[model samples]
Target: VGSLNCIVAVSQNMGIGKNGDLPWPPLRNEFRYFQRMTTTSSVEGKQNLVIMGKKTWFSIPEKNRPLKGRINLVLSRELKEPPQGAHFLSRSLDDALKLTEQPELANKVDMVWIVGGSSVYKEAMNHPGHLKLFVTRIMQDFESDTFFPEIDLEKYKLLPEYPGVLSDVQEEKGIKYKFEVYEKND
Candidate 1:
């Protein structure tokens, strides 16, 4: 029940977003990668749970939701309704974690994915159960007010390579980037 992972994209300066959306051009391939990770499960009846901060949820365009097959859970203290068709709403990260304990959802949820805003990222980064960090390093810097949390290299080791992830730098629309994954040392 503590199988929590994180996904984020950041520039050289650790900029995650600008105004209210991604600071750079859309990376279609990366988007596909995110979809792949969040929807996959070895258990036939299981689906992944994606939890994101309220601001993060608002940044998404309505047409792009409910994010397909994965269970979409939004964390918001002010939101009473489950933004659009989100499967669940949570006031706190701990409250959302408890959803995994319910018998009806226990067998149905294979993994927990923390998709984020800065505060959400901080919480997920420090979460005792978090084991993996999936980050897309944007090679160039952009104008962004939101930044990703600092990752402790001593606690997480970067893999030389990972399956289903690009091992080298890639370029699209003049921007350079790389996909990376880190596993918790302990």
Candidate 2:
């Protein structure tokens, strides 16, 4: 029983990153969208939890490590220390979700955001819960080494519109993309 959701920005070819960073230049609008989607709280005084793999945790710049108001849950099996500002460190994504199940955290967290590296995304895909996928479709292709995992279309259906999501195609850096959400039907 978790409000687990996947948020990703994929290039036209499904490439998500290159060398641990976005392959293309930052999309200002997309950045703002990410902030809004992952941080907004429908329940007053409760924050959202973002779970990411070790690699993804390191990819964030030190100054922005904790990522502001959101609770950072880093999944790292090797690091004995929970990086500089991580709120929680777990051996696996599953364990991190379990943390949210604890009484103290359950009341404080409203949603669980599955932020990714690669392996964490796979684990999230296997999660047995209602998963909402908020993906930004990049019209331009990038030379990326990290690819977003494939989703089973039969089990997921695209929502024509999602609350708070700008229903317009946005363009930045001469490329176009739209914010889309796929709700898990199974």
Candidate 3:
């Protein structure tokens, strides 16, 4: 395959959907935003793949169960069968990468995006290769039980924004947001 990249949203104190409210709507928006970004950018030629953890995959609305157009790969430590419409099933991050790198899959996949809860991103971030991350630093304080792993700023450099403000579609509780891209520093 071409390469792998990751995109994740994490809260130091919150789990994904808490108390019937999504504390981070910007995260879902970020996925749509990346889809648009990849479609319009040079990355379009590369086959688009979205790899997410089981919990993250389950969080997707039933109506949008299989993310259309892009290949969906779900990682689960216990899942024995791949979910409907999932292109590949993996038990760990390494297995996911291996699936993407299979000779039959090589050159067929342009980019692999790890869209996650928190643990998935933490695992992906520590992989041997570098990752290109698109993050939105929102301006709201959330009551969270799960959080993204702390990243070493010295290891990654921020890239310029794609332009324009990414509005928080599911706005609630006065949250302002901005999109940012980070790439591993060589």
Candidate 4:
């Protein structure tokens, strides 16, 4: 499979979700960053893969998913079928990654992104193939029921800048945040 990466937005306390939804008001620019980053592929005709837990899959607005222009994979042991509009469903992250390597998809996938809920983030962090994290540091605290797992600086280093990524702090709807990219050391 392509480089496995985890992408999420977290508050000062590493809070990711509240009541199974984003804790802050929608940040259009941040949303744009996610859309562009996840959909763009370096190889012509190849597509990126976005894998998320069932909760994250459902959190997306019904009409807005399979998150257009990319392949969507939802993880759930309980769900017997891919939810309407989702391209695939797997019980685990490894299984999802393995699916991308299948003969039918291997040549068509360019990158793999793990979008989240708490447990999925935790598991992705431990995946041996996991290569990078695209984190949006929301510079404030929010009441959250779900949290992102800690990023071990020992295993990954934050780059001052990354190609195709915005480096400046951004403000949207008065919420200040910055895009951060952490690459796992080889």
Cα lDDT for residue 68, model 2?
Answer: 82
Q: Indicate whether candidate 1 or candidate 4 has the larger TM-score.
A: 4
After the best TM-score superposition of candidate 1, give how far the Cα of residue 118 lies from its true spot, in angstroms: 1.1
Comparison by lDDT, 1 against 3, better one: 1
Which digits, one per residue and each the tens of the lDDT, describe model 2 over residues 63-160?
A: 77787889998888898978888988999776888889999798899988887877888778866668888989998889999989888888778898
lDDT (CA) per prediction: 0.85, 0.85, 0.66, 0.88
Q: In candidate 1, what are the lDDT values of residues 133-162, reduced to their tens digit?
A: 999999998999999999999888898998
Per-model TM against the reference: 0.94, 0.95, 0.79, 0.96
Error of 2 at 23 (Å): 0.9
Please list the residue runs of candidate 4 whose C-alpha ends up more than 4 Å from where it truly belongs after superposition.
none
Candidate with better TM-score, 2 vs 4: 4
Candidate 3 TM-score to native: 0.79
1-186: candidate 3 lDDT, tens digit per residue:
554566644343424445333566545555576566543324555567788888777777767767776778898878788887677888887888887778867666776787776778887776556677776565566776556676768887777554543533333335555666777834
Candidate 2 stretches with Cα past 4 Å from truth are: none
For residue 104, model 2's alpha carbon misses the true position, in angstroms, by 2.8
**Candidate 3 all-Cα RMSD:** 3.6
Model 1 segments beyond 4 Å from truth? Answer: none
150: Cα error in model 2, Å: 0.4
